[PDB]
PDB file of C-alpha atoms in Angstrom:
ATOM      1  CA  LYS A  18     -22.403  -5.181   2.998  1.00  0.00           C
ATOM      2  CA  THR A  19     -19.878  -2.506   2.063  1.00  0.00           C
ATOM      3  CA  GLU A  20     -18.231  -0.685   4.927  1.00  0.00           C
ATOM      4  CA  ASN A  21     -17.499   2.977   4.410  1.00  0.00           C
ATOM      5  CA  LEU A  22     -20.049   2.962   1.629  1.00  0.00           C
ATOM      6  CA  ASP A  23     -21.545   6.386   2.384  1.00  0.00           C
ATOM      7  CA  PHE A  24     -18.087   8.031   2.110  1.00  0.00           C
ATOM      8  CA  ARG A  25     -17.612   6.469  -1.307  1.00  0.00           C
ATOM      9  CA  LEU A  26     -21.068   7.365  -2.510  1.00  0.00           C
ATOM     10  CA  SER A  27     -20.737  10.951  -1.293  1.00  0.00           C
ATOM     11  CA  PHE A  28     -17.603  11.137  -3.460  1.00  0.00           C
ATOM     12  CA  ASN A  29     -19.958  10.841  -6.457  1.00  0.00           C
ATOM     13  CA  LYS A  30     -21.446  14.204  -5.498  1.00  0.00           C
ATOM     14  CA  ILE A  31     -18.140  15.955  -6.126  1.00  0.00           C
ATOM     15  CA  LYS A  32     -18.192  17.468  -9.597  1.00  0.00           C
ATOM     16  CA  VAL A  33     -15.107  18.597 -11.489  1.00  0.00           C
ATOM     17  CA  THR A  34     -15.773  21.675 -13.580  1.00  0.00           C
ATOM     18  CA  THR A  35     -16.507  21.114 -17.266  1.00  0.00           C
ATOM     19  CA  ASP A  36     -15.945  24.809 -18.082  1.00  0.00           C
ATOM     20  CA  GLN A  37     -12.677  24.919 -20.010  1.00  0.00           C
ATOM     21  CA  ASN A  38     -12.886  28.691 -20.388  1.00  0.00           C
ATOM     22  CA  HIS A  39     -13.185  29.836 -16.778  1.00  0.00           C
ATOM     23  CA  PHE A  40     -13.379  26.700 -14.663  1.00  0.00           C
ATOM     24  CA  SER A  41     -16.753  27.520 -13.149  1.00  0.00           C
ATOM     25  CA  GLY A  42     -19.388  25.270 -11.697  1.00  0.00           C
ATOM     26  CA  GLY A  43     -17.278  22.685  -9.932  1.00  0.00           C
ATOM     27  CA  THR A  44     -18.094  21.728  -6.389  1.00  0.00           C
ATOM     28  CA  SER A  45     -17.380  24.382  -3.758  1.00  0.00           C
ATOM     29  CA  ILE A  46     -15.784  24.065  -0.330  1.00  0.00           C
ATOM     30  CA  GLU A  47     -19.184  24.937   1.321  1.00  0.00           C
ATOM     31  CA  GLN A  48     -20.706  21.974  -0.470  1.00  0.00           C
ATOM     32  CA  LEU A  49     -17.774  19.628   0.393  1.00  0.00           C
ATOM     33  CA  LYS A  50     -18.065  20.570   4.092  1.00  0.00           C
ATOM     34  CA  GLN A  51     -21.832  19.893   4.022  1.00  0.00           C
ATOM     35  CA  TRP A  52     -21.147  16.381   2.816  1.00  0.00           C
ATOM     36  CA  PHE A  53     -17.890  15.493   4.576  1.00  0.00           C
ATOM     37  CA  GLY A  54     -17.503  17.937   7.447  1.00  0.00           C
ATOM     38  CA  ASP A  55     -14.245  19.705   8.140  1.00  0.00           C
ATOM     39  CA  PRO A  56     -11.251  18.481   6.187  1.00  0.00           C
ATOM     40  CA  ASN A  57      -8.442  16.690   7.959  1.00  0.00           C
ATOM     41  CA  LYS A  58      -5.887  18.688   5.993  1.00  0.00           C
ATOM     42  CA  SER A  59      -5.788  21.562   3.631  1.00  0.00           C
ATOM     43  CA  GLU A  60      -3.181  23.496   1.817  1.00  0.00           C
ATOM     44  CA  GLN A  61      -2.666  26.146  -0.765  1.00  0.00           C
ATOM     45  CA  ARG A  62      -0.843  24.765  -3.820  1.00  0.00           C
ATOM     46  CA  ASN A  63       0.922  27.543  -5.788  1.00  0.00           C
ATOM     47  CA  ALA A  64       2.541  27.330  -9.198  1.00  0.00           C
ATOM     48  CA  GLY A  65       3.295  30.568 -10.996  1.00  0.00           C
ATOM     49  CA  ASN A  66       0.233  32.771 -10.512  1.00  0.00           C
ATOM     50  CA  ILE A  67      -2.162  29.778 -10.267  1.00  0.00           C
ATOM     51  CA  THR A  68      -3.329  28.805  -6.784  1.00  0.00           C
ATOM     52  CA  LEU A  69      -5.354  25.726  -5.971  1.00  0.00           C
ATOM     53  CA  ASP A  70      -6.839  25.021  -2.581  1.00  0.00           C
ATOM     54  CA  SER A  71      -6.388  21.361  -1.787  1.00  0.00           C
ATOM     55  CA  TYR A  72      -8.570  19.652   0.867  1.00  0.00           C
ATOM     56  CA  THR A  73      -8.348  16.087   2.151  1.00  0.00           C
ATOM     57  CA  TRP A  74     -10.722  13.941   4.194  1.00  0.00           C
ATOM     58  CA  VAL A  75      -9.917  10.548   5.699  1.00  0.00           C
ATOM     59  CA  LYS A  76     -12.406   7.960   6.946  1.00  0.00           C
ATOM     60  CA  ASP A  77     -11.355   4.444   7.983  1.00  0.00           C
ATOM     61  CA  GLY A  78      -8.216   4.701   5.890  1.00  0.00           C
ATOM     62  CA  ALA A  79     -10.054   5.850   2.720  1.00  0.00           C
ATOM     63  CA  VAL A  80      -8.833   9.235   1.479  1.00  0.00           C
ATOM     64  CA  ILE A  81     -10.754  11.842  -0.532  1.00  0.00           C
ATOM     65  CA  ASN A  82      -8.959  14.837  -2.019  1.00  0.00           C
ATOM     66  CA  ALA A  83     -10.432  17.789  -3.891  1.00  0.00           C
ATOM     67  CA  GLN A  84      -8.460  20.644  -5.470  1.00  0.00           C
ATOM     68  CA  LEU A  85     -10.347  23.894  -6.117  1.00  0.00           C
ATOM     69  CA  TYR A  86      -9.541  26.939  -8.250  1.00  0.00           C
ATOM     70  CA  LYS A  87     -11.365  29.989  -6.956  1.00  0.00           C
ATOM     71  CA  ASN A  88     -13.715  27.713  -5.077  1.00  0.00           C
ATOM     72  CA  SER A  89     -14.492  25.440  -7.992  1.00  0.00           C
ATOM     73  CA  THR A  90     -13.297  21.778  -8.014  1.00  0.00           C
ATOM     74  CA  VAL A  91     -10.787  21.045 -10.806  1.00  0.00           C
ATOM     75  CA  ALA A  92      -9.528  17.684  -9.515  1.00  0.00           C
ATOM     76  CA  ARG A  93     -10.815  14.950  -7.214  1.00  0.00           C
ATOM     77  CA  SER A  94      -9.725  11.511  -6.056  1.00  0.00           C
ATOM     78  CA  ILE A  95     -10.626   8.682  -3.705  1.00  0.00           C
ATOM     79  CA  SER A  96      -8.185   6.016  -2.591  1.00  0.00           C
ATOM     80  CA  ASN A  97      -8.074   3.020  -0.346  1.00  0.00           C
ATOM     81  CA  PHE A  98     -11.660   1.887  -0.755  1.00  0.00           C
ATOM     82  CA  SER A  99     -13.387  -1.216  -2.131  1.00  0.00           C
ATOM     83  CA  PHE A 100     -17.047  -2.195  -2.457  1.00  0.00           C
ATOM     84  CA  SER A 101     -18.383  -5.484  -1.193  1.00  0.00           C
ATOM     85  CA  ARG A 102     -20.345  -6.620  -4.200  1.00  0.00           C
ATOM     86  CA  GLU A 103     -21.229  -9.553  -6.407  1.00  0.00           C
ATOM     87  CA  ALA A 104     -18.660 -10.892  -8.830  1.00  0.00           C
ATOM     88  CA  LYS A 105     -20.000  -9.918 -12.205  1.00  0.00           C
ATOM     89  CA  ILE A 106     -17.080  -8.830 -14.375  1.00  0.00           C
ATOM     90  CA  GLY A 107     -15.377 -11.539 -16.383  1.00  0.00           C
ATOM     91  CA  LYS A 108     -12.510 -11.732 -18.809  1.00  0.00           C
ATOM     92  CA  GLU A 109     -14.960 -11.388 -21.680  1.00  0.00           C
ATOM     93  CA  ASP A 110     -16.324  -8.115 -20.306  1.00  0.00           C
ATOM     94  CA  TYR A 111     -12.719  -6.870 -20.107  1.00  0.00           C
ATOM     95  CA  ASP A 112     -11.900  -8.042 -23.630  1.00  0.00           C
ATOM     96  CA  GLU A 113     -14.945  -6.207 -24.945  1.00  0.00           C
ATOM     97  CA  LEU A 114     -13.729  -2.792 -23.674  1.00  0.00           C
ATOM     98  CA  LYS A 115     -12.578  -0.775 -26.675  1.00  0.00           C
ATOM     99  CA  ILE A 116     -10.393   2.277 -27.082  1.00  0.00           C
ATOM    100  CA  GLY A 117     -12.749   5.230 -27.656  1.00  0.00           C
ATOM    101  CA  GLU A 118     -15.574   3.691 -25.640  1.00  0.00           C
ATOM    102  CA  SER A 119     -17.235   6.170 -23.224  1.00  0.00           C
ATOM    103  CA  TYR A 120     -16.767   6.142 -19.494  1.00  0.00           C
ATOM    104  CA  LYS A 121     -20.527   6.415 -19.202  1.00  0.00           C
ATOM    105  CA  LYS A 122     -21.087   3.201 -21.207  1.00  0.00           C
ATOM    106  CA  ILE A 123     -18.387   1.377 -19.266  1.00  0.00           C
ATOM    107  CA  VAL A 124     -19.872   2.247 -15.912  1.00  0.00           C
ATOM    108  CA  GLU A 125     -23.228   0.913 -17.169  1.00  0.00           C
ATOM    109  CA  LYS A 126     -21.473  -2.349 -18.050  1.00  0.00           C
ATOM    110  CA  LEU A 127     -19.056  -2.772 -15.130  1.00  0.00           C
ATOM    111  CA  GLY A 128     -20.665  -0.763 -12.375  1.00  0.00           C
ATOM    112  CA  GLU A 129     -18.840   2.062 -10.617  1.00  0.00           C
ATOM    113  CA  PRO A 130     -15.071   1.689 -10.174  1.00  0.00           C
ATOM    114  CA  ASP A 131     -13.980   1.172  -6.583  1.00  0.00           C
ATOM    115  CA  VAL A 132     -11.614   4.193  -6.745  1.00  0.00           C
ATOM    116  CA  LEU A 133     -10.896   6.933  -9.233  1.00  0.00           C
ATOM    117  CA  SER A 134      -8.950  10.155  -9.759  1.00  0.00           C
ATOM    118  CA  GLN A 135     -10.182  12.883 -12.185  1.00  0.00           C
ATOM    119  CA  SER A 136      -8.714  16.228 -13.207  1.00  0.00           C
ATOM    120  CA  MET A 137      -9.069  18.806 -15.879  1.00  0.00           C
ATOM    121  CA  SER A 138      -7.371  21.605 -17.595  1.00  0.00           C
ATOM    122  CA  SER A 139      -8.386  23.951 -20.328  1.00  0.00           C
ATOM    123  CA  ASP A 140      -7.043  21.452 -22.808  1.00  0.00           C
ATOM    124  CA  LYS A 141      -8.016  18.003 -21.571  1.00  0.00           C
ATOM    125  CA  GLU A 142      -9.793  15.961 -18.925  1.00  0.00           C
ATOM    126  CA  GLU A 143      -8.413  12.761 -17.540  1.00  0.00           C
ATOM    127  CA  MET A 144      -9.499  10.033 -15.286  1.00  0.00           C
ATOM    128  CA  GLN A 145      -7.939   6.924 -13.817  1.00  0.00           C
ATOM    129  CA  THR A 146     -10.253   4.212 -12.478  1.00  0.00           C
ATOM    130  CA  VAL A 147      -9.713   0.901 -10.606  1.00  0.00           C
ATOM    131  CA  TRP A 148     -12.050  -2.008 -10.153  1.00  0.00           C
ATOM    132  CA  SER A 149     -10.738  -4.091  -7.254  1.00  0.00           C
ATOM    133  CA  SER A 150     -14.132  -5.738  -6.533  1.00  0.00           C
ATOM    134  CA  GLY A 151     -16.996  -7.116  -8.630  1.00  0.00           C
ATOM    135  CA  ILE A 152     -14.646  -9.317 -10.678  1.00  0.00           C
ATOM    136  CA  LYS A 153     -15.469 -12.961 -11.380  1.00  0.00           C
ATOM    137  CA  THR A 154     -12.254 -14.871 -11.588  1.00  0.00           C
ATOM    138  CA  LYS A 155     -10.067 -17.543 -10.046  1.00  0.00           C
ATOM    139  CA  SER A 156      -7.885 -15.019  -8.193  1.00  0.00           C
ATOM    140  CA  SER A 157      -9.193 -13.008  -5.312  1.00  0.00           C
ATOM    141  CA  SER A 158      -6.611 -10.327  -5.970  1.00  0.00           C
ATOM    142  CA  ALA A 159      -7.698  -9.342  -9.472  1.00  0.00           C
ATOM    143  CA  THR A 160      -7.972  -5.718 -10.601  1.00  0.00           C
ATOM    144  CA  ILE A 161      -8.848  -3.765 -13.733  1.00  0.00           C
ATOM    145  CA  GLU A 162      -7.464  -0.248 -14.298  1.00  0.00           C
ATOM    146  CA  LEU A 163      -8.839   1.959 -17.049  1.00  0.00           C
ATOM    147  CA  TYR A 164      -7.503   5.335 -18.180  1.00  0.00           C
ATOM    148  CA  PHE A 165      -9.798   7.857 -19.753  1.00  0.00           C
ATOM    149  CA  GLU A 166      -9.195  11.037 -21.658  1.00  0.00           C
ATOM    150  CA  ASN A 167     -11.954  13.408 -22.373  1.00  0.00           C
ATOM    151  CA  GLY A 168     -14.497  10.869 -21.217  1.00  0.00           C
ATOM    152  CA  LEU A 169     -13.268   8.102 -23.532  1.00  0.00           C
ATOM    153  CA  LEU A 170     -11.223   4.969 -22.935  1.00  0.00           C
ATOM    154  CA  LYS A 171      -7.543   5.514 -23.744  1.00  0.00           C
ATOM    155  CA  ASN A 172      -5.899   2.432 -22.167  1.00  0.00           C
ATOM    156  CA  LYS A 173      -6.810  -0.679 -20.225  1.00  0.00           C
ATOM    157  CA  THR A 174      -4.811  -2.940 -17.917  1.00  0.00           C
ATOM    158  CA  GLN A 175      -5.580  -5.906 -15.663  1.00  0.00           C
ATOM    159  CA  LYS A 176      -3.982  -7.940 -12.882  1.00  0.00           C
ATOM    160  CA  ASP A 177      -4.753 -11.627 -12.337  1.00  0.00           C
ATOM    161  CA  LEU A 178      -7.829 -11.658 -14.640  1.00  0.00           C
ATOM    162  CA  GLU A 179      -6.478 -13.166 -17.883  1.00  0.00           C
TER     163      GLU A 179
END
């Protein structure tokens, strides 16, 4: 049984805009508050004439952040969370991951990463993902971290798996 599971799963409801022209259609603050209640912290992040509204929620040490441009999410992250789940990912599954492989395909194969951070700009989208559970190996401490660009695998790393 995974503690804090609902907080993690609600994180999947947060959508980063895919509109590289005008950044529309990302999750709004009204939606975030429906799911998570009032944020623990918020701040306006200014750079030149671009302003993002950054909001952070904390629950049992897990931290969710969302950054919104004109009330549309452009970046999101969760930290300090792990699932309690069956060990299914082995060294062979890791070895099979190929540069250019889609995030969608990889989640079908490995299950959802424990934590991730995702952002976009008009030029590119990126995502960093960590699996800290669901790994079948000698060491209890094993992790897999995958970097994605534009929805596709760009780099893979592992600790204590092979």
